[PDB]
Each structure stands twice: as structure tokens, then as C-alpha cells.
Design an enzyme around this catalytic site. Structure first.
Site, mmCIF file in Angstrom:
data_model
loop_
_atom_site.group_PDB
_atom_site.id
_atom_site.type_symbol
_atom_site.label_atom_id
_atom_site.label_comp_id
_atom_site.label_asym_id
_atom_site.label_seq_id
_atom_site.Cartn_x
_atom_site.Cartn_y
_atom_site.Cartn_z
ATOM 1 C CG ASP A 132 -2.307 0.846 1.186
ATOM 2 O OD1 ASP A 132 -2.618 1.308 -0.035
ATOM 3 O OD2 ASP A 132 -2.833 1.309 2.004
ATOM 4 N NE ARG A 136 -3.840 5.330 0.453
ATOM 5 C CZ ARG A 136 -3.544 5.137 -0.579
ATOM 6 N NH1 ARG A 136 -3.705 5.960 -1.664
ATOM 7 N NH2 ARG A 136 -3.412 4.039 -1.010
ATOM 8 C CG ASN A 137 -0.205 4.602 3.593
ATOM 9 O OD1 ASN A 137 -0.911 4.904 4.545
ATOM 10 N ND2 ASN A 137 -0.430 3.763 2.676
ATOM 11 C CG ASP A 150 -0.475 1.210 6.069
ATOM 12 O OD1 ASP A 150 -1.130 1.253 7.110
ATOM 13 O OD2 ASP A 150 -0.558 0.631 4.964
HETATM 14 C C1 LIG Z 1 1.482 6.514 16.692
HETATM 15 C C2 LIG Z 1 1.634 5.717 15.374
HETATM 16 C C3 LIG Z 1 1.161 4.429 15.576
HETATM 17 C C4 LIG Z 1 1.349 3.490 14.543
HETATM 18 C C5 LIG Z 1 1.735 3.955 13.316
HETATM 19 C C6 LIG Z 1 2.089 5.185 13.207
HETATM 20 CL CL1 LIG Z 1 2.677 5.701 11.647
HETATM 21 C C7 LIG Z 1 2.017 6.222 14.283
HETATM 22 N N1 LIG Z 1 2.535 7.563 14.158
HETATM 23 C C8 LIG Z 1 1.790 8.351 13.573
HETATM 24 O O1 LIG Z 1 0.830 8.270 12.973
HETATM 25 C C9 LIG Z 1 1.962 9.794 13.295
HETATM 26 C C10 LIG Z 1 3.345 10.369 13.527
HETATM 27 N N2 LIG Z 1 3.345 11.440 13.266
HETATM 28 C C11 LIG Z 1 2.378 12.044 12.619
HETATM 29 N N3 LIG Z 1 2.221 13.604 12.631
HETATM 30 C C12 LIG Z 1 1.158 14.203 12.092
HETATM 31 C C13 LIG Z 1 0.048 13.556 11.583
HETATM 32 C C14 LIG Z 1 -1.258 14.391 11.084
HETATM 33 C C15 LIG Z 1 -1.019 15.580 11.322
HETATM 34 C C16 LIG Z 1 0.169 16.241 11.663
HETATM 35 C C17 LIG Z 1 0.182 17.855 11.845
HETATM 36 O O2 LIG Z 1 0.227 18.405 12.715
HETATM 37 N N4 LIG Z 1 0.320 18.146 10.340
HETATM 38 C C18 LIG Z 1 0.584 19.315 10.302
HETATM 39 C C19 LIG Z 1 0.185 20.479 11.163
HETATM 40 C C20 LIG Z 1 0.474 21.779 10.962
HETATM 41 C C21 LIG Z 1 1.245 21.950 9.645
HETATM 42 C C22 LIG Z 1 1.615 21.095 8.759
HETATM 43 N N5 LIG Z 1 2.274 21.336 7.817
HETATM 44 C C23 LIG Z 1 1.284 19.814 9.269
HETATM 45 C C24 LIG Z 1 1.330 15.444 11.989
HETATM 46 S S1 LIG Z 1 1.250 10.951 12.941
#
Ligand SMILES: Cc1cccc(Cl)c1NC(=O)c1cnc(Nc2cccc(C(=O)Nc3cccc(N)c3)c2)s1
Length: 287
Positions: A132, A136-137, A150
Site C-alpha cells: 500500500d 498518504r502513507n 503503514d
Molecule cells: C503513533 C503511530 C502508531 C502507529 C503508526 C504510526 Cl505511523 C504512528 N504514528 C503516526 O501516526 C504519526 C506520527 N506523526 C504524525 N504526525 C502528524 C500527523 C497528522 C498531522 C500532523 C500535523 O500536525 N500536520 C501538520 C500540522 C501543521 C502544519 C503542517 N504542515 C502539518 C502530524 S502521525
């Protein structure tokens, strides 16, 4: 896989069954504190949900590479259960590029693709087939480093009944190689096809592959030999490489090592990137 005590985790903000939070993790026996992302699994989860949730962490814990999301640990002994990773400030790559349209240089975009390719080369060399791969991932940190995420047990367990699904829905076909769509033959070479689609996503700042075409229309086009046209302002070498990722015959596609090597050579001789593929135009007619 490190079991983390709940006293070491604070949640600051929701960023995304369960939720994903930004938070802080106290580590090194209380001497260090780092920002983290935290994913929860809420009460009432099924056995399958538990095995899939902890399975993604178990897989992530097997990797150690700059371009693969780093696992800090899990909370399994207390509820709600949590997976704790490094925090990627700029979130998913497709959204990031769609909010930054036209703001990066060609060299920056190619450098993002080199990082993704290095992470994928690492995965493939570990005998992990992603199935996948898509922008997006891929997550992006504050320093623009791209990291693959992912993961799931259905990708490694032998003849897993869910190996053809997402980490349970249909794998969106427009990123998937023809032999994986039609015969369920997922391999690193089908990940290479997906990587080519990711190159196109990156160079277009997050355009939807194949635009309005439906899934059956995408299958029709690819099986007729149609391929996505060049992005605007795209180096000819970069378009040629994505076209090679989309060879019908899998054995004709580059290996991830080839992709990393080519991207490195282009970045190191950046005049090679000034030859642009012709962008195929709309008819606007002026003197
Ligand atoms: C915790 C976890 C468990 C299993 C798999 C995974 Cl891959 C993860 N980790 C994550 O999902 C994440 C690790 N870091 C993440 N960062 C994130 C996700 C969604 C939004 C934002 C964010 O704050 N984006 C943002 C906010 C302001 C400006 C800009 N340019 C981007 C940041 S999400």
C-alpha cells in the site's frame, strides 16, 4: 519492543478504532523527554483488532532506518493500549504537498523521493512487501525528511487471508501494479510500480493519480498501455524513471537499489535535472 509505563506518556492534542495524539514521552529513566505521536485502541476492541494493532508495532520495531518511522514503544499492560512513535511535524506527504503547491525546488522534490526510495530499499531487503505504498502513507518531519509508514502482519504471515487488503478495505487500485490487481501477486516489484505512482504524486504536489477516472477506467487505461503523462516542470530523467517503474513486465522494472542509485547520481550532478520532459498541454491562443 519496549513496554512503556503510562506515567511516562502525556497527550497534548488530538491529530487524528481509537485516536492519534501529539504528546510527550519521558525516557532514559526520567532524564530525557521527547515529542511523540500516540495511537490508541479503545475498549471493546476485538481479538483481530488487538492482533493487528500490536502487530503493526511489532513490525515497526524490527526496523531501524532513517526513512522508516521509528517506534518508541507500546502500552499493552494498561488501557487504552497505545503505540508510541516519533512525531512527524508535517504529517502525511500527500496533504503536505497539496498545502505547499509549487513551493519546493525540483532538487527538494527529488531529495524527498530519494529518501522514500532508501526506506523502500531497506524494507525490500528485509523481505517486507508493503502492498500500500502511496504518498498518504509517507510522513514528513520539520526538516522535510520523508519516512515510510503503514505496516501490518497480513504482509508477512504466510497465505494471510487479509494479505490483499489494506491494513481491511480494498487497496486503492490506482497505486497497484497490474499483476497484483489481477492475480494478487504482490512483491517488491509491485511496490516499485507503486513507487512510480508516488514519484508522480510528489512531482505534481499531490495530484490524484489518473484524475477523475474510475477504478475500472484506470484498469482499462493501464492494460491498454496508457501511463500517467509527465508532471509540469518535471526533469526528463525523473519521468523516464517513473515510466520504467510502470513496465507491464515486472522483471523489467528497476529494483529499489537501482532507483536509489539513479536518484543519487541525478542529485549529485544537478545539471542533469535541467532537461525537462515536455508537458502535454488546453488550447489558449494569443498573438
Ligand atoms: C503513533 C503511530 C502508531 C502507529 C503508526 C504510526 Cl505511523 C504512528 N504514528 C503516526 O501516526 C504519526 C506520527 N506523526 C504524525 N504526525 C502528524 C500527523 C497528522 C498531522 C500532523 C500535523 O500536525 N500536520 C501538520 C500540522 C501543521 C502544519 C503542517 N504542515 C502539518 C502530524 S502521525
Amino acid at each position: 519492543t519496549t513496554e512503556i509505563h503510562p506515567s511516562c506518556v502525556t497527550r497534548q492534542k488530538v491529530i487524528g478504532f481509537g485516536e492519534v495524539y501529539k504528546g510527550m514521552l519521558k525516557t532514559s529513566s526520567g532524564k530525557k523527554e521527547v515529542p511523540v505521536a500516540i495511537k490508541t485502541l479503545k475498549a471493546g476492541y476485538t481479538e483481530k483488532q488487538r492482533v493487528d494493532f500490536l502487530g503493526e508495532a511489532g513490525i515497526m520495531g524490527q526496523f531501524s532506518h532513517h526513512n522508516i518511522i521509528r517506534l518508541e514503544g507500546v502500552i499493552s499492560k494498561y488501557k487504552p493500549m497505545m503505540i508510541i512513535t516519533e512525531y512527524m511535524e508535517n504529517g502525511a506527504l500527500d496533504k503536505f504537498l497539496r498545502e505547499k503547491d509549487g513551493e519546493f525546488s525540483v532538487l527538494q522534490l527529488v531529495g524527498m523521493l530519494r529518501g522514500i526510495a532508501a526506506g523502500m530499499k531497506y524494507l525490500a531487503n528485509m523481505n517486507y512487501v508493503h502492498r500500500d505504498l502511496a504518498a498518504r502513507n509517507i510522513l514528513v518531519n520539520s526538516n522535510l525528511v520523508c519516512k515510510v509508514s503503514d505496516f501490518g502482519l497480513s504482509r508477512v504471515l504466510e497465505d494471510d487471508p487479509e494479505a490483499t487488503y489494506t491494513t481491511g478495505g480494498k487497496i486503492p487500485i490506482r497505486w497497484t501494479a497490474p499483476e497484483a490487481i489481477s492475480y494478487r501477486k504482490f512483491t517488491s516489484a509491485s511496490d516499485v510500480w507503486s513507487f512510480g505512482i508516488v514519484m508522480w504524486e510528489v512531482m505534481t504536489y499531490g495530484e490524484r493519480p489518473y484524475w477523475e477516472l474510475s477504478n475500472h477506467e484506470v484498469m482499462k487505461a493501464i492494460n491498454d498501455g496508457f501511463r500517467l503523462p509527465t508532471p509540469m516542470d518535471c526533469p526528463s530523467a525523473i519521468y523516464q524513471l517513473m515510466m520504467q517503474c510502470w513496465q507491464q513486465e515486472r522483471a523489467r522494472r528497476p529494483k529499489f537499489a537501482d532507483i536509489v542509485s539513479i536518484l543519487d547520481k541525478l542529485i549529485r550532478a544537478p545539471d542533469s535535472l535541467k532537461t525537462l520532459a515536455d508537458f502535454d498541454p488546453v488550447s489558449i491562443r494569443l498573438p
